[PDB]
C-alpha cells in the first residue's frame, strides 16, 4: 500500500469511463440487487394520508469497467467518487417529497471490489403516500407500501431483485410508532407494463394495526360518562324542572362538542366510521333521556310518573349495555 | 419527539500529505479549500434534518499545522430524534442522545475518540431553556457492528428534568380549586335542587373541558400518564359530589 499505486489503479479505472452508458450497453440487462435497513417511521398522517420513512438504501451491481487487479482488498473510496460513476436511476414511485441527508457530508457509500462489483449506499428520508381505509376506524388495519422502480430503463436494460430474498429488509423491529404496531411486512418483485415498455419494480409493504388505548382514554370514556350523567336525571324528582332539564341540555351540548372535536382532526371522508356509529348511538341515548323527562312533564301537570321513572331507571343501563356489547362484538 | 441543537463541531486528524516545514505558524486557509481535501464522513445517526449555516459564507474552518494535523470545524443546526417516556409526565426525566458515526469507513479505516476527555463537550452548563433543566451530560465511545462490518461511534447524552412550575399553575391548582368549589354543594340547603344540580353539572363540565385542553400538545400515545390519573381522580371526586345530591 504505497498509496500511489492505488491512485494509478483508480485513475485508469476512470479516464475511459462514460457515465452516459450503462454497464453492458447493448448487452444483457444489468442485475441490480437492493436491500434496505429501516431506521424509523416518524409519522403516519391520516389527514395527509402519508408516512415518513428513514432508511439506508443499498444498491449492488457489477460494472466490468470498474474491475481492477493487483490490490486484493476492497476499495472504500470517498463518497464524492459517486459523481464520476454510473449509478442506477432508481426512484420511489409513490413518494411525495424525499431527500438525501447531507451533514456533515453527503451520506453516501461507494465500495468497489476487484471483480468490478459496486456497492452504493444512501441515507434517505422520504414521505410516501399511503391511502387509508377509515371505515372501521379506529379499529382499523392499514397497508402501506414503498414502490421502487427504474425511471428510465426498461427490463431490457436493468433488472431488480432483493438481496437475500425475505432477509433483504432489516430494522423492522426498530420502528416505534406510538399509535401503530407493525403486524407484518412483505417483499414483492414484479414487472409493470407501460406504453413505453415493461419496467422492473420492487415493493416493500407494511401492515399497521392501530392501538385503541388512546381512543378509549379520549373518546369512549367521556361519552359513557356523559350518558351516565344523563341517566342521573331520572333519580331527581319530577318537580325539579330546572335541575332535570339542565342535565339534558348539558349532556347534548357536551356530546355535540365531543363530535366537533373528534371530527375536526381527520380527513373529510364521505363515509361513516365506527366511532361515528358509537357516537350517534350515545347521542340518541341522551336524546331519549331528555325526551323521557319531557314526556313525563307533559303527562303530569300541563297535560304514573313513579312507574315510568322506575322503568326508565331499570331499562336505560340495560339497553346501553346491550348496545355497547353489540357494537364491540361487531367491531372485534 | 425531537430536540433542535446548534453547535460548533470540530474534528482533528493527522495527515502526512498536509505536512509542511519552514513556516513557524499554523495556517488558517479559506474554507473552500475543504473541497480539495479529504475529510471524514462523519454523520449523526439519530438526525431527522440538519444543515450547515451559510451566511455570510459557509460557516466552515480549515486549519493546518506544520506536523500535519488538520482541524476541521463546522457550525451545524440539527434536529435529532429523542424518544420520550411520558408515563410520569410532567414529573418525568428524559434521556436525549446525539449519536455520531462514520458512514462509510469501518474501524479498520477510521477511529473516533473524544478530544479533551470528559471535557470534550463545552457550553452545556450555560444552556437555559424554560421547560427543562439539564441535570447531567455524558460522553460515550463504542464500536457498533453491522453486516458490512464494525463502525466507530460517539454518543453525547443529556438528562433533562422537566420544571414542574407551569403545570402547577395551569393544571393541578385550577383542578384542585374546582374540586373545593364543587364541595360547596354540600353546605347549600337540600331543597335547592336547581342550585346544587347546577353546581354539580358545571363542575363536571369544567373538568371535562380542562381534560380536553390537555393532550393536544401531547402525542397520540396509548398509555395513561400521571396528569391523566390526577384529572381522572378529580373528575371522579366531582362526579361523586353530584351523585351525593342525587
Amino acid at each position, epitope marked *: 500500500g504505497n498509496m500511489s499505486f492505488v491512485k494509478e489503479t483508480v485513475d485508469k479505472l476512470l479516464k475511459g469511463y462514460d457515465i452516459r452508458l450503462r454497464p453492458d450497453f447493448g448487452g444483457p440487462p444489468v442485475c441490480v440487487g437492493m436491500n434496505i435497513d429501516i431506521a424509523s417511521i416518524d409519522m403516519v398522517s391520516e389527514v395527509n394520508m402519508d408516512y415518513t420513512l428513514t432508511m439506508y438504501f443499498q444498491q449492488y451491481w457489477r460494472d466490468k469497467r470498474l474491475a481492477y487487479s493487483g490490490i486484493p482488498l476492497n476499495l472504500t473510496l470517498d463518497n464524492r467518487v459517486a459523481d464520476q460513476l454510473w449509478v442506477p436511476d432508481t426512484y420511489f414511485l409513490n413518494d411525495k417529497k424525499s431527500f438525501v441527508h447531507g451533514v456533515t457530508v453527503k451520506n453516501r457509500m461507494i465500495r468497489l471490489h476487484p471483480d468490478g462489483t459496486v456497492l452504493y449506499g444512501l441515507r434517505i428520508t422520504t414521505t410516501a403516500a399511503c391511502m387509508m381505509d377509515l371505515r372501521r376506524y379506529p379499529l382499523d388495519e392499514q397497508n402501506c407500501t414503498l414502490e421502487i422502480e427504474s425511471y428510465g430503463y426498461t427490463t431490457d436494460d436493468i433488472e431488480f431483485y432483493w438481496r437475500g430474498g425475505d432477509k433483504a429488509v432489516t430494522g423492522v*423491529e426498530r*420502528i416505534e410508532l406510538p399509535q401503530f*404496531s*407493525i403486524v407484518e411486512h412483505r417483499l414483492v418483485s414484479r414487472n409493470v407494463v407501460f406504453a413505453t415498455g415493461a419496467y422492473p419494480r420492487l415493493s416493500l409493504s407494511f401492515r399497521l394495526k392501530r392501538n385503541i388505548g388512546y381512543f378509549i382514554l379520549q373518546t369512549y370514556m367521556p361519552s359513557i360518562l356523559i350518558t351516565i350523567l344523563s341517566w342521573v336525571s331520572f333519580w331527581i324528582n319530577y318537580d325539579a324542572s330546572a335541575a332535570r332539564v339542565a342535565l339534558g341540555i348539558t349532556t347534548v351540548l357536551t356530546m355535540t362538542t365531543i363530535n366537533t372535536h373528534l371530527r375536526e382532526t381527520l380527513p373529510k371522508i364521505p363515509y361513516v366510521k365506527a366511532i361515528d356509529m358509537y357516537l350517534m348511538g350515545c347521542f340518541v341515548f341522551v336524546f331519549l333521556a331528555l325526551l323521557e323527562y319531557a314526556f313525563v312533564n307533559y303527562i303530569f301537570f300541563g297535560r304514573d310518573v313513579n312507574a315510568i321513572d322506575r322503568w326508565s331507571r331499570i331499562v336505560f343501563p340495560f339497553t346501553f349495555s346491550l348496545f355497547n356489547l353489540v357494537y364491540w362484538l361487531y367491531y372485534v | 419527539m425531537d430536540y433542535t441543537l446548534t453547535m460548533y463541531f470540530q474534528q482533528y486528524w493527522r495527515d502526512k500529505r498536509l505536512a509542511y516545514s519552514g513556516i513557524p505558524l499554523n495556517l488558517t486557509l479559506d474554507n473552500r479549500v475543504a473541497d480539495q481535501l479529504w475529510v471524514p464522513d462523519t454523520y449523526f445517526l439519530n438526525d431527522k434534518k440538519s444543515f450547515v449555516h451559510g451566511v455570510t459564507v459557509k460557516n466552515r474552518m480549515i486549519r493546518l499545522h506544520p506536523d500535519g494535523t488538520v482541524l476541521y470545524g463546522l457550525r451545524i443546526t440539527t434536529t435529532a430524534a429523542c424518544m420520550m417516556d411520558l408515563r410520569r409526565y410532567p414529573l418525568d426525566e428524559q*434521556n436525549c442522545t446525539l449519536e455520531i458515526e462514520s458512514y462509510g469507513y469501518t474501524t479498520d479505516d477510521i477511529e473516533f475518540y473524544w478530544r479533551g476527555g470528559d471535557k470534550a463537550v463545552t457550553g452545556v452548563e450555560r444552556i437555559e431553556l424554560p421547560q427543562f433543566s439539564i441535570v447531567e451530560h455524558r460522553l460515550v465511545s463504542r464500536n*457498533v*457492528v453491522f453486516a458490512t462490518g464494525a463502525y466507530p461511534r460517539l454518543s453525547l447524552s443529556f438528562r433533562l428534568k422537566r420544571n414542574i412550575g407551569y403545570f402547577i399553575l395551569q393544571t393541578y391548582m385550577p383542578s384542585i380549586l374546582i374540586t373545593i368549589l364543587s364541595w360547596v354543594s354540600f353546605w347549600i340547603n337540600y331543597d335547592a335542587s336547581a342550585a346544587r344540580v347546577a353546581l354539580g353539572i358545571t363542575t363536571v363540565l369544567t373538568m371535562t373541558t380542562i381534560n380536553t385542553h390537555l393532550r393536544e400538545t401531547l402525542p397520540k400515545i396509548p398509555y395513561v400518564k400521571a396528569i391523566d390519573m390526577y384529572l381522572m381522580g378529580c373528575f371522579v371526586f366531582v362526579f361523586l359530589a353530584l351523585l351525593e345530591y342525587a
Partner: nanobody
Amino acid sequence: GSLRLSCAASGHTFNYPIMGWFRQAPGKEREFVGAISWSGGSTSYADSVKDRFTISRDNAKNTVYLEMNNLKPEDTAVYYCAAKGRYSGGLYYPTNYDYWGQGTQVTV
C-alpha cells in the same frame, strides 16, 4: 415435551427497547436465537429455529417468554437474555448488547 423459558427485566427498560435470546453450547461462541421489540409486534428468529421456537413479550409484567417446541439433541445449551439500546444496530451480533442474563442451562 416443550420448554418455556422466561426472562424478567428490572430498571431503565425504556432506554433498551430490544430484548434478545441467545444460545451457547460448549466449544462454540454464543449464537443468536431470537429478538423482540418494545411493542412486541415485530419478532426475529435465527435461520435454524424457524417455527420450532417462539418469542412473546408481556409488558407491565415486563417479561419475555421463549417457548420451545419439538426439541432436538443440538438444542442442549445455556440460554441467555440480553437487552440492546435504541441505537445499536444489528440483532445477530452479541457485542451490540449491553446487559446480559445468567445463562440458564437446558439439556435434552
